[PDB]
Ligand binder design. Structure first.
Ligand SMILES: [Zn+2]
Ligand SMILES: [Zn+2]
Ligand SMILES: [Zn+2]
Ligand SMILES: [Zn+2]
Ligand SMILES: [Zn+2]
Ligand SMILES: [Zn+2]
Lengths: 146, 147
């Protein structure tokens, strides 16, 4: 039941945002609330039916901005995943490559309009090599953070 | 990176574990395990490359079936040496078959890339890239189940 699951995970995320207001320093929570509004605005403006963005369609300047927002939000997401921060365990170059890998993965979700597991067979030819390299890199990062 | 030194040490460490298997295993159990392992080590010397990896796709169907049966019987000892539960107990029969196939694909790609370490998909040949990814994922999936 993809709908119910989504509803529940929505209320659950809303509850975490509330625990974030309580637990975060005052400046920290300003900066975070702001970053997250940029992200949620961007998914409403550019995202598909599932809220996935085709980052390759965007201008280089907006793509730079989105990548900056996700760099700032990423350590909160790591913590919610029960992992150590990927920013701390990765190099600056690697952390940049990681954001790019995540973007590639989101683009492929747009092209295959798939919400769960991507089937490598269904990925357009233009994106196969790039996708597989991003999956592999995301796995390497995941193992460094637990 | 000292490939020789690490390969020598792992060699001696594996011999120590064979010695402890002679001691810890039932008489029949160790008889059957010693034969299966001999099949495995004979097959790697007959068909393996410089690193002892086999191109299972080049072999006859009959021989490939045979090597898969040998690996099915050795796999729970290997699970135990990794400090893991038996993949055999935690997977269905069809999944365990596909696991062995994943491991064989992984072995083939090692022959093609000539690499004994982490395989980068870039360096894997086009006829093999998608199979390799699928095998790595399934291997990942199984590994999560046995911890
Ligand atoms: Zn609290
Ligand atoms: Zn870059
Ligand atoms: Zn993880
Ligand atoms: Zn003992
Ligand atoms: Zn089969
Ligand atoms: Zn493991």
């Amino acid at each position: 039941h993809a709908g119910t699951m989504t509803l529940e995970a929505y209320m659950r995320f809303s509850a975490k945002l509330s625990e974030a207001k309580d637990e975060m320093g005052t400046k920290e929570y300003e900066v975070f609330t702001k970053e997250l509004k940029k992200l949620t605005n961007a998914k409403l403006a550019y995202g598909d039916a599932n809220g996935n963005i085709d980052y390759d369609a965007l201008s280089p300047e907006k793509r730079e901005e989105m990548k900056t927002v996700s760099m700032g939000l990423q350590p909160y997401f790591d913590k919610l995943n029960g992992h150590k921060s990927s920013k701390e365990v990765l190099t600056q170059e690697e952390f940049d490559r990681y954001m790019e890998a995540l973007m590639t993965h989101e683009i492929v979700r747009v092209k295959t309009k798939s919400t769960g597991a991507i089937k490598v067979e269904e990925v357009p030819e233009a994106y196969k090599e790039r996708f597989m390299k991003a999956e592999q890199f995301m796995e390497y990062v995941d193992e460094k953070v637990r």
